[PDB]
Homo-oligomer: A and B are copies of this chain.
Amino acid sequence: VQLVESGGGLVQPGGSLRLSCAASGFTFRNSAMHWVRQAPGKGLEWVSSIWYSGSNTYYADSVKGRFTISRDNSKNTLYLQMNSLTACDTAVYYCARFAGGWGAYDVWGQGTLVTVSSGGGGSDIVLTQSPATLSLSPGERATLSCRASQSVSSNYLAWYQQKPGQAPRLLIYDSSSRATGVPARFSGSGSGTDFTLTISSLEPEDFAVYYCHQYSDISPTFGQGTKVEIK
């Protein structure tokens, strides 16, 4: 009693793959068959199901409208056609027989890794911001930090303010240049991998989420933000 899985691999975004699952040791034509996936370091996630007949296909929202489940009962084979692949599809995909009240997922394929990426073997510049949250009162000085995983060419680092429900607003660019109209209490500094945004004296309108942003290469990245809230 087994499910012999095949397919998968590393594919460019937008691409297509077909997974296969050849069944033996049970009455395939009498069995509902499902796909389940598991993103790296994450939990099991249902993907798709098909009735013994080939009718009544169902799909999780993560794949609906892009993936197609099908079966060939005369070949005891289940398929998952994956189209328009995107980075968030990256995961180990398992086929499974669904026995319902007579066994849940009682037969599993061994799984195959699908990775959707156009990336080289290197890594992007990761920006870490500290602290995650600042509880301050108006009048106090706030010092925000942005730490880059590697050096930032030309000091191409910018800071943005974002209030709830509003677009980001440029504060500082080139690590230290104040954007037009920005009050003088906003000052940025640093070079290389360590950068700092300073608000000399907080006003009530300064409470917001602040983002750092590096634009030194073709893969611009952002920090995850620092929230300045009233204490």
Contact = CB atoms under 8 A, between A and B. Distances in A.
Interface of A: 12-15, 34, 36, 42-46, 49, 58-66, 83-88, 94, 98-106, 108-111, 116-119, 154, 156, 158, 160, 162, 166-170, 173-174, 179, 211, 213, 215, 218-225
Given A108-B167, A108-B169, 16 more contacts: A13-B59, A13-B65, A42-B224, A44-B160, A46-B222, A61-B116, A61-B118, A65-B85, A65-B86, A84-B84, A88-B88, A101-B156, A101-B173, A104-B213, A106-B173, A108-B170
**5 smallest beta-carbon distances between A and B, as pairs:** A14-B65, A104-B158, A84-B84, A88-B88, A104-B173
A147 to B, nearest CB: 15
Contacts of A173: 99, 101-104, 106
Q: How many copies does the complex hold?
A: 2
B100 A215 contact: yes
Contacts of A101: 154, 156, 173-174
B213 A110 contact: no
A68 to B, nearest CB: 11
Contacts of A104: 156, 158, 170, 173-174, 213, 215
A111 B154 CA distance: 29
Nearest to A167: B108
B65 A105 contact: no
A122 to B, nearest CB: 14
Nearest to A221: B46
29 contacts: A12-B64, A13-B59, A13-B66, A36-B168, A44-B168, A45-B222, A46-B219, A46-B222, A49-B220, A58-B218, A58-B219, A61-B86, A61-B87, A61-B119, A62-B87, A62-B88, A63-B86, A83-B84, A84-B86, A100-B156, A101-B154, A101-B156, A103-B173, A104-B173, A104-B174, A104-B215, A105-B160, A106-B173, A108-B167
